Coordinates of N, CA, C and O and ligand atoms in Angstrom, one line a residue:
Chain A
X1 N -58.6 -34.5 -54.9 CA -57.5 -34.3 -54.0 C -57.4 -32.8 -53.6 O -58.1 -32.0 -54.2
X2 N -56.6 -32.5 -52.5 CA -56.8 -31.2 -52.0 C -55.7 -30.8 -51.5 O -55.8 -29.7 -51.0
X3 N -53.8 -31.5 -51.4 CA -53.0 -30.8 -51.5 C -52.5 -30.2 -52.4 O -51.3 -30.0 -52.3
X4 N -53.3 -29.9 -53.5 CA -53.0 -29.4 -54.6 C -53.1 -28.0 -54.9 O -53.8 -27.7 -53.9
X5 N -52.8 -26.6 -55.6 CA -53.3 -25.7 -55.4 C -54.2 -25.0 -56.7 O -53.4 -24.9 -57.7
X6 N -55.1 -24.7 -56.9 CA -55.3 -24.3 -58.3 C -55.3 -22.3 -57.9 O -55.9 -21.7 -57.0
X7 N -54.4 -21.7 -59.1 CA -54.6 -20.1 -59.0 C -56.4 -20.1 -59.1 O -57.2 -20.0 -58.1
X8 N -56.8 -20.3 -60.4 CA -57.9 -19.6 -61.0 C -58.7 -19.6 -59.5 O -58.9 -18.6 -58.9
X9 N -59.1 -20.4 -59.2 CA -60.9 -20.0 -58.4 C -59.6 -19.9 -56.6 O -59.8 -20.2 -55.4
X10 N -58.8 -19.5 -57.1 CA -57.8 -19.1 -55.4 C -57.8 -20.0 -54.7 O -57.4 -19.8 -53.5
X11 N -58.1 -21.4 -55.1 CA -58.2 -22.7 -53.8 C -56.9 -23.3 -53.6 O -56.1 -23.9 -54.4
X12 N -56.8 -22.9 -52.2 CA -55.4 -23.5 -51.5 C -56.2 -23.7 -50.1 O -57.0 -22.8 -49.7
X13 N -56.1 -24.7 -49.5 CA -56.3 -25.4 -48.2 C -55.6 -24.0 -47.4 O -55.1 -22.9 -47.8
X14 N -55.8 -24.7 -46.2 CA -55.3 -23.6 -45.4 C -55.3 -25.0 -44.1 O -56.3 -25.6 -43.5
X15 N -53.6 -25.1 -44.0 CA -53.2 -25.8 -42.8 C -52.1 -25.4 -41.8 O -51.5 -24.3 -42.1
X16 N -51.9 -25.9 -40.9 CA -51.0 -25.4 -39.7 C -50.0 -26.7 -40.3 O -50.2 -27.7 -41.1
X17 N -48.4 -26.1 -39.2 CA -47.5 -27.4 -39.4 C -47.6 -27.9 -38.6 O -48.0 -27.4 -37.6
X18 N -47.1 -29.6 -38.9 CA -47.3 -30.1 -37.6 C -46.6 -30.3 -36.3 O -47.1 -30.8 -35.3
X19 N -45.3 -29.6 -36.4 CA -45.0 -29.5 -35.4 C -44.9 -28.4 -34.4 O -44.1 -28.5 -33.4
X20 N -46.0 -27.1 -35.0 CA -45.9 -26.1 -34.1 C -47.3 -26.7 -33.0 O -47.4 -26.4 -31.8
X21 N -48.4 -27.7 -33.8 CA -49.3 -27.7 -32.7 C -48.6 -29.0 -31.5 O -48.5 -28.7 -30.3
X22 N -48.2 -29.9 -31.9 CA -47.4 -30.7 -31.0 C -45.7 -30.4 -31.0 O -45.3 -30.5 -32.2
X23 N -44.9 -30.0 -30.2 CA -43.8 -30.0 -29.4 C -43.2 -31.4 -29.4 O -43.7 -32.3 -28.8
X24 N -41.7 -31.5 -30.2 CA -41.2 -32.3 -30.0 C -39.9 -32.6 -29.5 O -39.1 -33.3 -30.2
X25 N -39.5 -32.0 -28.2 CA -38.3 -31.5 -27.5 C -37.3 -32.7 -27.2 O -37.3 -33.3 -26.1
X26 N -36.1 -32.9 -28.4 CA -35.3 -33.8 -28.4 C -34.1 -32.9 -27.9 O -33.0 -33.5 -28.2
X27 N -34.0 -31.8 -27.4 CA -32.8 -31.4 -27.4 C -32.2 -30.8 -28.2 O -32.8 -30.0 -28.9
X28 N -30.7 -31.0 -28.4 CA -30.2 -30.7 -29.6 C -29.0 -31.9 -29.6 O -28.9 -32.9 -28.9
X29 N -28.0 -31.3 -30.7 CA -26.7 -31.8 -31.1 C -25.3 -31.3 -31.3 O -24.6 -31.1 -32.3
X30 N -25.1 -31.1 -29.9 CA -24.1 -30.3 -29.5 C -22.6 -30.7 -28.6 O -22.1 -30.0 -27.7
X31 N -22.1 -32.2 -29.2 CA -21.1 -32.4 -28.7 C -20.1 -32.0 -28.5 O -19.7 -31.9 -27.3
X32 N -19.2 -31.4 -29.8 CA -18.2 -30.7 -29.8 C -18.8 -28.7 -29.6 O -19.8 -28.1 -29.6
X33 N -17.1 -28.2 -29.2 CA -17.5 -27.0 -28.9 C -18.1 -26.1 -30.7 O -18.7 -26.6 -31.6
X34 N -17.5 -24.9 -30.5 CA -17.3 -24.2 -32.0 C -16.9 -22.5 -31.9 O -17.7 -21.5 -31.7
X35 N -16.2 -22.6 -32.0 CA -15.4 -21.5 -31.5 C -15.3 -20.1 -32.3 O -16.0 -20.3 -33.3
X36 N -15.0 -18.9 -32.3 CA -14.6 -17.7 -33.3 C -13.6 -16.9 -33.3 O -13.5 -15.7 -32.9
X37 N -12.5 -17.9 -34.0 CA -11.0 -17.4 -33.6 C -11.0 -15.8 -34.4 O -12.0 -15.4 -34.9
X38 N -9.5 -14.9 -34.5 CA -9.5 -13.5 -34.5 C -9.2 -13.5 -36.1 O -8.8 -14.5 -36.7
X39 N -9.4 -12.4 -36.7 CA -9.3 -12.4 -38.1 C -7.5 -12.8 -38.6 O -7.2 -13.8 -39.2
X40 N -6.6 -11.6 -37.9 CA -5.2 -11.8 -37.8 C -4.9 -13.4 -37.8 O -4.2 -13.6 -38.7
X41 N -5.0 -14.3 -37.2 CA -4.9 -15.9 -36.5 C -4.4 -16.0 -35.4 O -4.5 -17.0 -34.8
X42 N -3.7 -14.5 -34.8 CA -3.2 -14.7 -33.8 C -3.6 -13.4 -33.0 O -3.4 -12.3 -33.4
X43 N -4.2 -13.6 -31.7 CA -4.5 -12.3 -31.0 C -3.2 -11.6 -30.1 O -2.3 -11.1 -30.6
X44 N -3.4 -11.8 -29.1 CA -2.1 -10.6 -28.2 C -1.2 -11.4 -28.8 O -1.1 -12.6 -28.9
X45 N -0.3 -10.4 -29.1 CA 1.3 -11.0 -29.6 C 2.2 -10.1 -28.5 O 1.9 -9.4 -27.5
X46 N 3.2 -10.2 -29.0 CA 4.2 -9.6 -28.4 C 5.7 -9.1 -29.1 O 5.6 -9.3 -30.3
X47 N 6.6 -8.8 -28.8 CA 7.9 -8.3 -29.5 C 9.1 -8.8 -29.2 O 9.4 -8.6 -28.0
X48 N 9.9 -9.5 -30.0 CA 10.6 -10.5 -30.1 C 12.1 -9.9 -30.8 O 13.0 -10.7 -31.0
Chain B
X1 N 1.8 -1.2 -23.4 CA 1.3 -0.7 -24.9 C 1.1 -1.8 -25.4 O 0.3 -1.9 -26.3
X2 N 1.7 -2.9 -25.0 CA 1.2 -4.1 -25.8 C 0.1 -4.4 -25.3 O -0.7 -3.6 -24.8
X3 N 0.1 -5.8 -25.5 CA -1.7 -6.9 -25.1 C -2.8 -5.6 -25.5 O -3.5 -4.8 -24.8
X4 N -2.6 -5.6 -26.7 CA -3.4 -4.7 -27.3 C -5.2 -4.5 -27.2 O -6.0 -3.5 -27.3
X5 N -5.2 -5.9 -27.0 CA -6.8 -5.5 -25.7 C -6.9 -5.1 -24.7 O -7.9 -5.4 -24.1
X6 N -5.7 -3.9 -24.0 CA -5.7 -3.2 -23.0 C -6.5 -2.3 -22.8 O -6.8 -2.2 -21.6
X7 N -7.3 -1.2 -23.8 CA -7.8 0.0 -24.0 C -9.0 0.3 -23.8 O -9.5 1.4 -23.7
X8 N -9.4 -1.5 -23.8 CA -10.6 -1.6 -23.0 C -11.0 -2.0 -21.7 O -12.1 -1.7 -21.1
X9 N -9.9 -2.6 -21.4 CA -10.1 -3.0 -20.0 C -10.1 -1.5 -19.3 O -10.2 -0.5 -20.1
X10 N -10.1 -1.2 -17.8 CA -9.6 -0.2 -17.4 C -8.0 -0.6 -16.7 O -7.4 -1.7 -16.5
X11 N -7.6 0.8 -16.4 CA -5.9 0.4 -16.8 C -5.3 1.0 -15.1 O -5.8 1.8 -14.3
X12 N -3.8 0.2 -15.0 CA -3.3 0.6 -13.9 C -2.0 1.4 -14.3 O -1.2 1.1 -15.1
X13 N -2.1 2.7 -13.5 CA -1.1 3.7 -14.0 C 0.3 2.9 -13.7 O 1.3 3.4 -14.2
X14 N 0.3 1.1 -12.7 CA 1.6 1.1 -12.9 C 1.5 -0.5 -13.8 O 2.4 -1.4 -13.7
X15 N 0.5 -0.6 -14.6 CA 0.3 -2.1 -15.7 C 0.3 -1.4 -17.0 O -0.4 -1.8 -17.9
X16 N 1.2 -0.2 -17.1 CA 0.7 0.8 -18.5 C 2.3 1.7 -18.6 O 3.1 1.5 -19.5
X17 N 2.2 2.6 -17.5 CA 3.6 3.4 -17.3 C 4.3 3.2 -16.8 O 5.1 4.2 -16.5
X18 N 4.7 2.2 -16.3 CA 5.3 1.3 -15.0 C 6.2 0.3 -15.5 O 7.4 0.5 -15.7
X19 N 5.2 -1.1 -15.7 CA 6.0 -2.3 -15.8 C 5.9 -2.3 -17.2 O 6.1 -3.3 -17.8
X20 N 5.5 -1.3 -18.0 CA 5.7 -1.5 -19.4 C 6.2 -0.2 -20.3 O 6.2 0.8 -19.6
X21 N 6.5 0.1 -21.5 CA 6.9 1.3 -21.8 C 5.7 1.7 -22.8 O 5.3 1.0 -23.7
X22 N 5.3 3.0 -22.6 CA 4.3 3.4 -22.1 C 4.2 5.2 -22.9 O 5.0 6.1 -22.8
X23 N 3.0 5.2 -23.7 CA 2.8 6.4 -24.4 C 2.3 7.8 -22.7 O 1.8 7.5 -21.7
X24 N 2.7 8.6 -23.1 CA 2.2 10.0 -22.8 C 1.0 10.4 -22.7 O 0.5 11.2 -22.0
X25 N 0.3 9.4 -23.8 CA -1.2 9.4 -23.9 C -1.5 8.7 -23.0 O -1.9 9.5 -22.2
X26 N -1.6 7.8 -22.7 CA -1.8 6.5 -21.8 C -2.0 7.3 -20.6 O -3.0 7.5 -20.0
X27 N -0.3 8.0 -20.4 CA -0.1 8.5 -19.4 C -1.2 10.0 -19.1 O -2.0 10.4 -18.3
X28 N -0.7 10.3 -20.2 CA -2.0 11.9 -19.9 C -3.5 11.3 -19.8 O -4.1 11.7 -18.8
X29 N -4.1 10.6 -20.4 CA -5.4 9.7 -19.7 C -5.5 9.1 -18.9 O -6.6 8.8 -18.6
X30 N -4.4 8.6 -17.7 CA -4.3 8.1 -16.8 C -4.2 9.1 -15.2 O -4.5 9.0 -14.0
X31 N -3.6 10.4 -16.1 CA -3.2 11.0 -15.0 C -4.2 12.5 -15.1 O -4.7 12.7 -14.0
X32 N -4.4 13.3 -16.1 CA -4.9 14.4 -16.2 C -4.7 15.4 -15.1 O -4.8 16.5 -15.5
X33 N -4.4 15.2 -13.8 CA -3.7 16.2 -12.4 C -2.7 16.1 -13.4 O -2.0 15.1 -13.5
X34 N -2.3 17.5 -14.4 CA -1.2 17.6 -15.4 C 0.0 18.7 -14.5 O 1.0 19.4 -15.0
X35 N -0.3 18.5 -13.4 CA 0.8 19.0 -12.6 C 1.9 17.6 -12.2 O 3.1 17.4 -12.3
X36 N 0.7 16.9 -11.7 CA 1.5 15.5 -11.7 C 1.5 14.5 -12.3 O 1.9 13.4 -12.1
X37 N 0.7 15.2 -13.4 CA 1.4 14.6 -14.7 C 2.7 14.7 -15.3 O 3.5 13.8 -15.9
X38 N 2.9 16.2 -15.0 CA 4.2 17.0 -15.4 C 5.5 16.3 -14.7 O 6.6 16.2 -15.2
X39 N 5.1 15.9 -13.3 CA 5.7 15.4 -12.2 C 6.2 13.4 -12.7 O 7.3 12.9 -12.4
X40 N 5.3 13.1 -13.2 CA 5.4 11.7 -13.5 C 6.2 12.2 -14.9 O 6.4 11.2 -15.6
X41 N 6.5 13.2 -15.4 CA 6.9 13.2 -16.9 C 8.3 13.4 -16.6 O 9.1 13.2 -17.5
X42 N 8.5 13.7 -15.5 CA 9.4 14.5 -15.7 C 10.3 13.3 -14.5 O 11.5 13.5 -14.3
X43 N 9.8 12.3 -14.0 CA 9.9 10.6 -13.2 C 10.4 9.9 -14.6 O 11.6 9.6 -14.8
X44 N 9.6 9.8 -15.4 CA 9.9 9.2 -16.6 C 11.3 9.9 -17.2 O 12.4 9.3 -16.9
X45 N 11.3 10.8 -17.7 CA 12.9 11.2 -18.0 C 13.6 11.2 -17.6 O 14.5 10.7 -18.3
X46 N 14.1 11.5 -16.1 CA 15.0 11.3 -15.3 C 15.4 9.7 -15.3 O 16.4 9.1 -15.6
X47 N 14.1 9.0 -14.8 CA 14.1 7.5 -14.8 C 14.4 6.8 -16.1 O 14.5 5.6 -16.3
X48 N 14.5 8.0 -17.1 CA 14.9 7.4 -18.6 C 15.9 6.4 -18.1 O 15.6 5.4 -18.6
X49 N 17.0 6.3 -17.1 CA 18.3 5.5 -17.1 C 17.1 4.2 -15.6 O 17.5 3.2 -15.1
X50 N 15.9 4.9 -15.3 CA 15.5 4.1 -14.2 C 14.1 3.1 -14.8 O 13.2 2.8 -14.0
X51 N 14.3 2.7 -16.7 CA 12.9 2.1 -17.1 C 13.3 0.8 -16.8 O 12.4 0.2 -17.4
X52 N 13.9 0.0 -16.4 CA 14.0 -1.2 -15.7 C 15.2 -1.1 -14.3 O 15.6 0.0 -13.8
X53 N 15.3 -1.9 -14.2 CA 13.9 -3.1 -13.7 C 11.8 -2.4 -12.9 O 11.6 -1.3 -13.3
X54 N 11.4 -2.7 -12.4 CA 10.2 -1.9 -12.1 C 10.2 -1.6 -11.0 O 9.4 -0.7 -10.6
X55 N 11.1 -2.2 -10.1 CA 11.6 -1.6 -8.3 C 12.7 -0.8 -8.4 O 13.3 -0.3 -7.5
X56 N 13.1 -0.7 -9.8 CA 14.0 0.8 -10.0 C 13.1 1.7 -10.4 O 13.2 2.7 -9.8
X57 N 12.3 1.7 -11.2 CA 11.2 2.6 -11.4 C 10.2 3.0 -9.9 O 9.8 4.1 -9.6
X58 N 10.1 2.1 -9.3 CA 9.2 2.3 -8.2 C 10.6 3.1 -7.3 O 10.2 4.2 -6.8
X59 N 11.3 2.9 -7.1 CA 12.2 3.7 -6.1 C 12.4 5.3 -6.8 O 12.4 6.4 -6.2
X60 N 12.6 5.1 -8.5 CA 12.7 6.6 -9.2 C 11.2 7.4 -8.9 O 11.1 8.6 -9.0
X61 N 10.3 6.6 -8.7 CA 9.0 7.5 -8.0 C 9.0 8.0 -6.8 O 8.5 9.1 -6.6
X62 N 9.8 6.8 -5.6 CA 9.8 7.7 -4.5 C 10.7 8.9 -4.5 O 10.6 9.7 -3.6
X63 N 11.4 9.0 -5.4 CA 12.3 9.9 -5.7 C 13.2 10.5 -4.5 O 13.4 11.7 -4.4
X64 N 13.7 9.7 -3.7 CA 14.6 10.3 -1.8 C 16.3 10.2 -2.9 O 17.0 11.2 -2.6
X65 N 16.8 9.5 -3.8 CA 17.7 9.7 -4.9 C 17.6 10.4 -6.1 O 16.8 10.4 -7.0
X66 N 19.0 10.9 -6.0 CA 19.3 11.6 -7.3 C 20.2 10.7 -8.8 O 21.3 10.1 -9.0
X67 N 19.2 10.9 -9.4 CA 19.3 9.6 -11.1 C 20.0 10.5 -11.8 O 19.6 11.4 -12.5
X68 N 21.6 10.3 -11.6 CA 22.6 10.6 -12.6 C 23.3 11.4 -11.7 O 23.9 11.1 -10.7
X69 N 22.9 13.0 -12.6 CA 23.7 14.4 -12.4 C 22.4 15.2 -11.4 O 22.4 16.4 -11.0
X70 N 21.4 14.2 -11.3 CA 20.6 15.0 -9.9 C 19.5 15.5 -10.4 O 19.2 16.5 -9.7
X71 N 18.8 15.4 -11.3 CA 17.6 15.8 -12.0 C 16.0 15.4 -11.2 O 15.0 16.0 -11.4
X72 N 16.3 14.5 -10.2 CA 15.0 14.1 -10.0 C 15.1 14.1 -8.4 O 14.0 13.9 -7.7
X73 N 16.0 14.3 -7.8 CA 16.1 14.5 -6.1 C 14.9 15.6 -5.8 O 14.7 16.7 -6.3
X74 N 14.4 14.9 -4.9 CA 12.9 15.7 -4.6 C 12.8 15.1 -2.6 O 11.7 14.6 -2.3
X75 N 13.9 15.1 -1.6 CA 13.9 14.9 -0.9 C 14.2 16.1 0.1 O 13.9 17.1 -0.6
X76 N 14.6 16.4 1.2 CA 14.7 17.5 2.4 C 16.0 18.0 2.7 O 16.3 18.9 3.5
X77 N 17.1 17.3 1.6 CA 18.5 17.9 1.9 C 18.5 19.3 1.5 O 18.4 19.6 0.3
X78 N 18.6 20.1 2.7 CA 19.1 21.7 2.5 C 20.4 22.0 2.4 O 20.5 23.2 2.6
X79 N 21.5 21.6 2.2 CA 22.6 21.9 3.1 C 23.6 21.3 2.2 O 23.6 20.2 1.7
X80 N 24.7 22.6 2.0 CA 25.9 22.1 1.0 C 27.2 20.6 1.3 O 27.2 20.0 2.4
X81 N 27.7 20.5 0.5 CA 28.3 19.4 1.0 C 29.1 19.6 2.2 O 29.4 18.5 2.7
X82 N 29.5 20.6 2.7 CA 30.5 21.6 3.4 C 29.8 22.5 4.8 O 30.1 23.4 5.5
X83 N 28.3 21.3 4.6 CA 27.5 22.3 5.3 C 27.1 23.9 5.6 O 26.4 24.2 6.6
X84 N 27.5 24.7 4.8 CA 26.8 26.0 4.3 C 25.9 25.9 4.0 O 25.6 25.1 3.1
X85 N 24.7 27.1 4.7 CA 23.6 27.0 4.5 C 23.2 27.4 3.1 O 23.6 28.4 2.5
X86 N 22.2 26.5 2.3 CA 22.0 26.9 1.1 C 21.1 28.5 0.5 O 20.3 29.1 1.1
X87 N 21.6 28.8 -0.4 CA 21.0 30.2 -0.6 C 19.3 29.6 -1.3 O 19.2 28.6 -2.1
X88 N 18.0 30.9 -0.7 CA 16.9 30.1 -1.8 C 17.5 30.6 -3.1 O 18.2 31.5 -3.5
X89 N 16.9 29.6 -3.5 CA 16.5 29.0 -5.2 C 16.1 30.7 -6.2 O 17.0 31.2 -6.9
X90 N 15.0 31.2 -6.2 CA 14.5 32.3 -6.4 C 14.9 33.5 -5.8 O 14.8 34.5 -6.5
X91 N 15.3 33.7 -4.2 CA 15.6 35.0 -3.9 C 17.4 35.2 -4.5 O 18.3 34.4 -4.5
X92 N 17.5 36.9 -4.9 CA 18.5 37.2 -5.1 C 19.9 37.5 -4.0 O 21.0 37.9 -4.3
X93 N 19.2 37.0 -2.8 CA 20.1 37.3 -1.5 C 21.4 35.6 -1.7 O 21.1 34.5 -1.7
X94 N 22.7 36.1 -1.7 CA 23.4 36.8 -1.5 C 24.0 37.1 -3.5 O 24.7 38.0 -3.9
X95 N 23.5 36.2 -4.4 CA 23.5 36.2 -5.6 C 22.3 36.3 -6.7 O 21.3 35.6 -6.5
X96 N 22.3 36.9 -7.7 CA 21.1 37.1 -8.9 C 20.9 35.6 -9.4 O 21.0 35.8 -10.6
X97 N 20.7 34.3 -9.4 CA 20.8 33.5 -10.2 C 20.0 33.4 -12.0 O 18.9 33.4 -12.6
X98 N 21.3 33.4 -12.2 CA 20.5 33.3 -13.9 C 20.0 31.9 -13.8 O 19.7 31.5 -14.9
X99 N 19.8 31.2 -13.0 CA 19.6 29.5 -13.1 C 18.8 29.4 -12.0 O 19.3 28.8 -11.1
X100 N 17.4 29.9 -11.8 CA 16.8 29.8 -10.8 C 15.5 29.2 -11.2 O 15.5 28.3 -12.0
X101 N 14.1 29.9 -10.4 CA 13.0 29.2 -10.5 C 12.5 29.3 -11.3 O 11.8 28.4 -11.7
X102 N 12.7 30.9 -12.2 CA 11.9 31.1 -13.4 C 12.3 30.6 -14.5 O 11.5 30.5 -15.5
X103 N 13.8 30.0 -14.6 CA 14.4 28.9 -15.5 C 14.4 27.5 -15.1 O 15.1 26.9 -16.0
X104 N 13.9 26.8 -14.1 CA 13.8 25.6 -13.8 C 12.7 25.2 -12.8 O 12.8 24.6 -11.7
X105 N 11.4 25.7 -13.3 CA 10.4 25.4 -12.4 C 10.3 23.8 -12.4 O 10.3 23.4 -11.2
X106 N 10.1 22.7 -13.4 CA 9.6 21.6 -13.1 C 10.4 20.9 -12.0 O 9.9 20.0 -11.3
X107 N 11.7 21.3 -11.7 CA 12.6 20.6 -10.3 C 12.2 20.4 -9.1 O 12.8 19.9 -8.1
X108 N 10.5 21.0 -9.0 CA 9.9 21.6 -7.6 C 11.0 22.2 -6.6 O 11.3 21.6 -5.6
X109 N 11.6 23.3 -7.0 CA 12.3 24.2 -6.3 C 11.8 24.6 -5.1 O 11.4 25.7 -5.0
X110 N 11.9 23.5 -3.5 CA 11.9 23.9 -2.5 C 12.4 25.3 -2.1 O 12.8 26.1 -2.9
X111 N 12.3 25.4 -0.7 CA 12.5 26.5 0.2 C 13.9 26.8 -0.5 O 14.1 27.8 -1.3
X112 N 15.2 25.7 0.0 CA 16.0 26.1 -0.2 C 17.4 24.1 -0.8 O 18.5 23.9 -1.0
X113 N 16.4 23.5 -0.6 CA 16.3 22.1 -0.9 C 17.2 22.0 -2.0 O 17.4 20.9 -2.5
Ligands
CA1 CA1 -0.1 -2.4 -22.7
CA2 CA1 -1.3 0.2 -24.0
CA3 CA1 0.3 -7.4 -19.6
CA4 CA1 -6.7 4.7 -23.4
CA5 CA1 -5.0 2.4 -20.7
CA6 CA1 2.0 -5.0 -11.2

């Protein structure tokens, strides 16, 4: 077998992944928004 | 001075010193002509009784009225109530005034106004 790695004699295969040589463009998953509200919780305020 | 993300936007001398109440800084960064800056400082004090509404402020700019005891009249009236012609401001003719231009420069002491 040869996905195996042994240190001693340095043998490791040498492979690519497989999805850098084929492209598999599904898009993404992006229904809802996602927002980055202000640290305070509340930004311009005012005086009351 | 509020909506505290103002400082970045760029600013309107009348969305800052105007319709809102308003630092000196604001104002001295807004204005730096520190003559008329001196001039708007001195709109602002007088207008101290004219910080609302903002078309009372905009009328204490055009300044053709006098706000109170007459601090900010900056209009063409020469002439006493009695019509006597007014003496200047700075010359000693027909009186020395202890109360003249070298004691009240910011009034823009006209001719004789
Ligand atoms: Ca403001
Ligand atoms: Ca401000
Ligand atoms: Ca505002
Ligand atoms: Ca500023
Ligand atoms: Ca500003
Ligand atoms: Ca406005």
């Amino acid at each position: 077998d040869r996905t195996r790695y042994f240190s001693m004699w340095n043998q490791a295969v040498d492979s690519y992944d497989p999805d850098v040589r084929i492209i598999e463009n599904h898009g993404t998953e992006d229904e809802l928004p996602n927002y980055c509200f202000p640290l305070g919780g509340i930004g311009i305020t005012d005086t009351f | 001075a509020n909506t505290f993300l103002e400082e970045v936007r760029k600013g309107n001398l009348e969305r800052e010193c105007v319709e809102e109440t308003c630092s000196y800084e604001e104002a001295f960064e807004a204005l730096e002509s520190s003559t008329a800056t001196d001039v708007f400082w001195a709109k602002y004090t007088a207008c101290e009784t004219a910080r609302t509404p903002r078309d009372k402020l905009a009328a204490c700019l055009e300044g053709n009225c006098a706000e109170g005891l007459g601090t900010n009249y900056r209009g063409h009236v020469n002439i006493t109530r009695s019509g006597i012609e007014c003496q200047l401001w700075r010359s000693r003719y027909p009186h020395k005034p202890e109360i003249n231009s070298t004691t009240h420069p910011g009034a823009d002491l006209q001719e004789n106004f």
